[PDB]
Amino acid sequence: AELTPILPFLFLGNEQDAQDLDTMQRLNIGYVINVTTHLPLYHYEKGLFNYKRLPATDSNKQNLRQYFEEAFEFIEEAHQCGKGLLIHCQAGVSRSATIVIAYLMKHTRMTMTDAFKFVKGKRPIISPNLNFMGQLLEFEEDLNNGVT
Ligand SMILES: CSc1scc2c1-c1nc(SCC(=O)C(C)(C)C)ncc1CC2
Numbered sequence: 001a002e003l004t005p006i007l008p009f010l011f012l013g014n015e016q017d018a019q020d021l022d023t024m025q026r027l028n029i030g031y032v033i034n035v036t037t038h039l040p041l042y043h044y045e046k047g048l049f050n051y052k053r054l055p056a057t058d059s060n061k062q063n064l065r066q067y068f069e070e071a072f073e074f075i076e077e078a079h080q081c082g083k084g085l086l087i088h089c090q091a092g093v094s095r096s097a098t099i100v101i102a103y104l105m106k107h108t109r110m111t112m113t114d115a116f117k118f119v120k121g122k123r124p125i126i127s128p129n130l131n132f133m134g135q136l137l138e139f140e141e142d143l144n145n146g147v148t
Contacts (some may be wrong), residue, residue: 004084004123009079011086012020012123018042018088023124024049035095057095060131065139068102070125075103092099092127102139106148108125112140 001020003011018032019042030049034041036054042052052074054067061144071087078085091097097119106114120126 003029006100006104006119006122008073009082009084010100010103011074011084012096012125013086013088014093014095015039016089018086021046028082028084030076030081031078031085033074033085033087033096033099035067035087035099036088038050038115039090043134050074054095054099056089056095058089058127058129060129062095062131064098064132064148065135065137066093068099068106068139071099072103076083083085093123094127094129094132097126098125098132098136100108102136105136105140106143117138 001017003013003017003022003023005011009020021043032049033052033054035054035056037057038145041051041053043049054071056062056064087096087099101115101119104110104118105112109116
């Protein structure tokens, strides 16, 4: 049950990783982003975590760029209060890895490929999907022609 730490307060996992409550609390995670339409918000009724759903499919037509800003705000909310945030989807982590990489590109000032190489080093099994990759490329330009 690996919850891959990407930053000290930002973790990435699949559907089975998000179900390990005892590891969540050990790592002081109080925020969860569920990047699926169909999975439950694990541990919702327990009243322990703040939740956000990005209702996205792992398809070639899914727009994830629309969710970047909303997701970055939830990450910084956890960061500013000293709590960890878990972002997960399913096996292959295609959706959640895209959002994690996008965050690193904006607030770590890495390039698209540098962020991808950084994440792959920590979670070696990332399933590819060219549609999300193209959205990250467009995202890189919007960054390079803006502030921070
Ligand atoms: C931003 S990805 C990137 S940049 C340069 C390369 C790649 C890459 N990525 C992947 S898997 C990750 C993905 O496709 C996501 C679902 C997170 C968008 N497989 C192969 C390659 C080839 C080289």
